[PDB]
Amino acid sequence: MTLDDLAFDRRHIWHPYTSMTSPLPVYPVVSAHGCELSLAGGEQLVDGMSSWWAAIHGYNHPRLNAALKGQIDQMSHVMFGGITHPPAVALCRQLVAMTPASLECVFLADSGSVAVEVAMKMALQYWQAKGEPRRRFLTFRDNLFAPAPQSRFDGEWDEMDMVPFARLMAAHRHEIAAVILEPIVQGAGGMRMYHPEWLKRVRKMCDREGILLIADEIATGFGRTGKLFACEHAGITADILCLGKALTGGTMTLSAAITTRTVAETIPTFMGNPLACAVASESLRLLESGEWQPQVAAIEAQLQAELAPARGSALVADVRVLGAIGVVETRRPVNMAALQRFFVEQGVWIRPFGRLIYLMPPYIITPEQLTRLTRAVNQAVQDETFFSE
Amino acid sequence: MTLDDLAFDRRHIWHPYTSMTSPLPVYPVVSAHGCELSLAGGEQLVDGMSSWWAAIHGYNHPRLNAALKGQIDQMSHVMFGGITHPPAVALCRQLVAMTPASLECVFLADSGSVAVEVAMKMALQYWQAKGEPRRRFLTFRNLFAPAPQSRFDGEWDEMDMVPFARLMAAHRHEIAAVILEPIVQGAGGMRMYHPEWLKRVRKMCDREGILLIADEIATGFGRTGKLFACEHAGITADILCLGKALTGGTMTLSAAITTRTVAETISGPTFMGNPLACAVASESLRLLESGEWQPQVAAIEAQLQAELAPARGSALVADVRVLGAIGVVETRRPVNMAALQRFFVEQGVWIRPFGRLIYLMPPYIITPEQLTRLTRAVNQAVQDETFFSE
Ligand code: NA
Ligand code: NA
């Protein structure tokens, strides 16, 4: 990477959540290995982000690499219209086998958002097919927005938390096609965390009304909260389960909606992409050993222990840990340039956002690597200069 | 592929535009090379579909393979938030250089539909920032203008634009953008519109300050005989959407490219900027830099025109329309999908019809003899009433 390359990127390449008139500095990553990113200048960074959830096996994994290369040798891609192929069948067999018995029909898609859109369309066609059309969705913050439950996710449950959902349900039961939620951890909602009893109660209220439950586990799935699927924290199963990110080991995009036979019965170039299916199958094979379970429990326990002192910082509003996820929510938004520089100069890759400094490291991270991550977070939230007003 | 694999696919795996209670038969493909697909039984099929547009360089292409493997050796993926990397820069350099000078800010995305959604969100934020929030889009069949009736390759009747001009003027303060596919409607029944229509849209958008979004996810990268189909009208969009043939049909990636004025007025996504997809897209574009796609596509077009022309004489054919490496036979009655698909496979060709459409969009590397197999099969098909419902 050259100085001109960085000028070109700055002037011509959009990055997430940044402007093009006043972009923030970006760091040139040229390669990656293990739990580390290699900068163009040669600096190594301990990754604390898993490239946002997905890179649970780390970077440059030999088995993911070999799966990709082996599929390339046969075919990178063929259309799925009127055609099926070994990678799609192998992947769907794994997805059906590893999910609860009732989840058995797989709709492959490119991206997480498309799999959620597909789930919602399934819910629309379900009710249309049943002679009872329903067009509204209920989600948590003409759609219906219920507030988040207040009870601390790892503490005691107050039944009063369900009143706004219950009253919305009582008022609109017959118009609601589906409830859509992320189980426990709100990867799309400020990394907030909800009590599992809330999820248990939503499932029961849906059961009572015949309403479909759509679980978005694109962020939570595949072991990240300490359960293979985060729905397990409440003991419930969704009618439609949406999956992605760690599905491919974070090598390339792929997603899936898995539903029941009752939904499926009552019911374009890259759909089923062989290359992505082959690497996702290898990513799932890595999970089959069960090693992710003591890995994530060890990460969870270290995160609890090394982030607990952040609760003592006047700038910290909350610390919340679940599985291989540690969130420090601050009282004031971060100074993005200054704080990101500090992290890189400390040899760690941690990408904060607004009032959030959070860790979601790859499952293969070492204790010492993780301590580097939590050390930097604790140092950050003790200094005002890393925070605007 | 085993019988149990087929039974598992049928019972548990959705395919595009098919039911789950009564799926049509699907054919097991296990590998692909050149311009051919290899079925589990060893049969080779000549591909006429490019896996829907994108596989313009054919299958198992050595340069595309080496690009992918070379990137895997460095990294398959890293996030794009706070980070840039050599593959994203190399691809965006190519996309900026190969497009008109006004198109210079690249937003990379996962899939075709996301690039269009990003373009529309750009248009919304463009007007929101100018204190003039506009929320509606005008497309051709939201405001829907009648598709222009002038035959795409024939004479122009400017009366085609009167309904559009009426709608645009009546709603000029609600319209954030016109969205269209240039000439060929890959998402509109493979219909084809006159370039003068596209020229007039651009000029009307200019007078009103309305953004023009060109979806070239299907038409882009030489398919219509021009590098971008906008060239048939001599116009440039405010936002250009690209995908499919971007990666050589190896894996999904898309982009929305806009002007500096759009980008300035405006001013996590795990897989945005994916190094692996950018690396193979760069090599796909490198393959086009020789310009060899031009006479390849011109030869395909002339062979399509000649070998599809007799189908116009078939009582079952309403229209034949050919542009670049696209040949469309629109029938008067919809096809019997199972029986017609079996006939194509038995003939050794992969042609995937839909409703009243039997169409060809072969890889650019297809030989004359391979392509004649495709056109002969189509001509045989539309002379036989057995392949059509009522
Ligand atoms: Na299952
Ligand atoms: Na350009």
DSSP string over A86-107: HHHHHHHHHHHHHS-TT--EEE
Give yes or no for a contact between A47 and A59, defined as CB atoms under 8 angstroms apart. yes
Q: Which residue has the tokens 């990003």?
A: B118
Strand partners of residue B137: B177
Touching check for B63 and chain A: CB below 8 Å? no
**What does the alpha-carbon distance between residue A91 and residue A153 come to, in Å, rounded to a whole number?**
33
Give yes or no for a contact between B370 and B35, defined as CB atoms under 8 angstroms apart. yes
Q: What share of chain A is helix, strand, coil (3-state, %, to 5)?
A: 40, 20, 40
Angstrom resolution of this structure: 1.9
**What does the alpha-carbon distance between residue A251 and residue B268 come to, in Å, rounded to a whole number?**
15
Neighbours of A45 (CB within 10 A): 22
Q: Which residue has the tokens 């974070």?
A: A250
In 3D space, the residue among B135, B137, B131, B322 whose CA is nearest the CA of residue B215 turns out to be B137
**Chain A 1-60, residues with CB within 8 Å of chain B CB atoms:** 1, 5-6, 8-9, 12-17, 19-22, 24, 26-32, 37, 49, 51-55, 59-60
Touching check for B254 and chain A: CB below 8 Å? no
Task: Say which amino acid occupies B231.
Answer: E
Residues of A with Cβ-Cβ distance to B111 under 8 angstroms: 110-111, 114, 253, 270
B88:A64 CB<8 A: no
Strand partners of residue B109: B254
Strand partners of residue A328: A319, A357
B270:A53 CB<8 A: yes
In 3D space, the residue among B73, B69, B272 whose CA is nearest the CA of residue A250 turns out to be B272
Task: State the DSSP code for B10.
Answer: H
Q: HEC string of A54-78?
A: CCCCCECCHHHHHHHHHHHHHCCCC
**Chain A 313-342, residues with CB within 8 Å of chain B CB atoms:** 340
Domain B62-289, CATH:
3.40.640.10
Give yes or no for a contact between A184 and A193, defined as CB atoms under 8 angstroms apart. yes
Contacts of A315 (CB under 8 A, 6+ apart): A330, A331, A332, A381, A382, A384, A387
Give, in order, the Cα–Cα distances in Å from A199 to each of A112, A139, A236: 21, 12, 8
Sheet holding B44-47, edge to edge: A83-84, B27-33, B36-39, B44-47, B349-350
Give, in order, the Cα–Cα distances in Å from B80 to each of A8, A50, A57, A343, B272: 15, 12, 19, 17, 6
Q: Which residue has the tokens 């958008």?
A: B205
Touching check for B165 and chain A: CB below 8 Å? no
Mutual angle of helices B275-289 and B62-72, in 10-degree steps: 150
Q: How far is the CA of B353 from the centre of ligand 2 (A)?
A: 36
Name the helix (H) or strand (E) containing B307. helix B293-308
Greatest alpha-carbon pair distance for chain B in Å reads 63
Task: Say which amino acid occupies A378.
Answer: N
**The two three-digit tokens of residue B133, written as one number:** 């929030």
Give, in order, the Cα–Cα distances in Å from A86 to each of A23, A194, A307, B387: 44, 39, 45, 30
**What does the alpha-carbon distance between residue B293 and residue B216 come to, in Å, rounded to a whole number?**
17
Give yes or no for a contact between A245 and B270, defined as CB atoms under 8 angstroms apart. yes
Give the residue ranges of DSSP H helices in chain A. Answer: 3-12, 62-74, 86-98, 112-129, 163-172, 196-209, 261-266, 274-288, 292-307, 336-345, 367-380
**What does the alpha-carbon distance between residue A136 and residue B302 come to, in Å, rounded to a whole number?**
51
Give the technique used to solve this structure.
X-ray
A199 burial type by CB count under 10 A (0-12 exposed, 13-18 middle, 19+ buried): buried
Task: Say which amino acid occupies A349.
Answer: W
In 3D space, the residue among A263, A275, A256, A286 whose CA is nearest the CA of residue A107 turns out to be A256
**Which member of A17, A26, A92 has the closest CB to residue B83?**
A26
Give, in order, the Cα–Cα distances in Å from A122 to each of A134, A169, A241, A253, B22: 12, 21, 12, 22, 17
Neighbours of B57 (CB within 10 A): 25
Helix (H, G, I), strand (E, B) or coil at B211: strand
**What does the alpha-carbon distance between residue B50 and residue B204 come to, in Å, rounded to a whole number?**
35
Task: Say which amino acid occupies A189.
Answer: G
Give, in order, the Cα–Cα distances in Å from A55 to each of A64, A125, B174, B266, B283: 11, 34, 43, 32, 25
Strand partners of residue B359: B328
**What does the alpha-carbon distance between residue B316 and residue B331 come to, in Å, rounded to a whole number?**
6
B29:A78 CB<8 A: yes
Contacts of B138 (CB under 8 A, 6+ apart): B144, B145, B164, B167, B168, B171, B175, B177, B178, B179
Neighbours of A338 (CB within 10 A): 14
**Chain A 336-375, residues with CB within 8 Å of chain B CB atoms:** 340, 351, 353
